[PDB]
Amino acid sequence: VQRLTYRRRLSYNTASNKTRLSRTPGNRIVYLYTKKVGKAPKSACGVCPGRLRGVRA
Amino acid sequence: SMLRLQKRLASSVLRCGKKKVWLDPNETNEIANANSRQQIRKLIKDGLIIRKPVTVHSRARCRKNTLARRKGRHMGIGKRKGTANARMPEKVTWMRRMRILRRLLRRYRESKKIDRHMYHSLYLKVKGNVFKNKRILMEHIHKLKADKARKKLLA
């Protein structure tokens, strides 16, 4: 099976080197580097454990 | 001749290994002067360079054996190396059983075969290991309904 390589010089599995597999129009699997997961705002009350609604994460 | 360059270029152009590149042993003079990928592409089209087929690794032998195992062959005491739990974990067996039996209780309650009071009583018994499989549970519910119906008639 096809085996993958990083497309950048960071050879380490750090928080900033995360990837997902992607099939291309050329019919091959490559790495796409993902963006970190964003977080919705936390309520200013400091009491409610959930995050807010109607706001992009 | 020394066709190291052509072997490397043909491999790159064909997207295979250098082991799958085949250079025509009768045409080595022609191939010897293809110093570019353009010329290598031409020789591939002409037929002096070919990609050899994958070496055969048939799955027929194991496909045949897998059918035998599906019928119980090659599965006796003398063919086991992991433990019963390693071969089929108890937790997964329990998880399958609980989902099956909890699914049946939900469908009986929604279909009104049982009421929420009987569902709740049976739910905690299902969690208690009282019933071993779907059938035993279903026959028990049938008994309960008969007894419940009898009392209603007397009442």
Binding site: - | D24, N26, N29, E30, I44, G47, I50, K52
Partner: protein, 62 residues
């Protein structure tokens, strides 16, 4: 390209054991960049020059 050609060529090369020392460099024996029409045109210019001069001399010889 017919993949059977690997076998044909491979077997054909193995026949070279009997003609060691005179193996043919190229199997594909089969071009003059000079087009045949133009080559004939060039012949009509150069070769004829000697021939015509003789005829013109012949014409002046009678």
């Amino acid at each position: 390209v017919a993949k059977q050609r690997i076998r044909m060529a491979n077997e054909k090369h193995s026949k070279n054991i009997t003609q060691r020392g005179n193996v043919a460099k190229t199997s594909r024996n089969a071009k003059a960049s000079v087009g045949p029409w133009l080559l004939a045109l060039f012949i009509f210019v150069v070769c004829g020059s000697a021939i015509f001069q003789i005829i013109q001399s012949i014409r002046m010889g009678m």
